[PDB]
DNA sequence: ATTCGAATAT
DNA sequence: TATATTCGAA
């Protein structure tokens, strides 16, 4: 059946712990660098997608206006 | 080809 | 609102 890319995975929830890795990670990142895929890549989460990445870091940047 | 990201959808 | 998906741009 499906797998990797193609999983059709359930909606992601960004638990305090998952949102505090994520934010460990961008704020440590060049902020050239601070894109979704090396985001993701450099959170180290079996199972988190470029797109979960993406869609919380839209919403970040306007947290940190 | 790839992937970003504001806009939009659910 | 939080998270997902679209789609034009880089």
Same mark, same amino acid.
């Given at each position: 059946? @499906? #797998?990797?890319?193609? !999983?059709? @995975?359930? @909606?992601?929830?960004?638990?305090? #712990?998952?949102?505090?890795?994520?934010?460990?990670? $961008? *704020?440590? !990142?060049?902020? /050239?660098? *601070?894109?979704?895929?090396?985001?993701? #890549?450099?959170?180290?989460? %079996?199972?988190?997608?470029? %797109?979960? $990445? *993406?869609?919380? !870091?839209? /919403?970040?940047?306007?947290? !940190? /206006?």
């Amino acid at each position: 059946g @499906r #797998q990797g890319k193609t !999983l059709k @995975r359930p @909606r992601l929830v960004w638990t305090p #712990q998952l949102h505090k890795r994520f934010v460990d990670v $961008v *704020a440590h !990142l060049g902020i /050239k660098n *601070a894109v979704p895929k090396t985001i993701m #890549q450099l959170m180290n989460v %079996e199972g988190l997608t470029r %797109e979960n $990445v *993406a869609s919380h !870091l839209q /919403k970040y940047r306007l947290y !940190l /206006k």
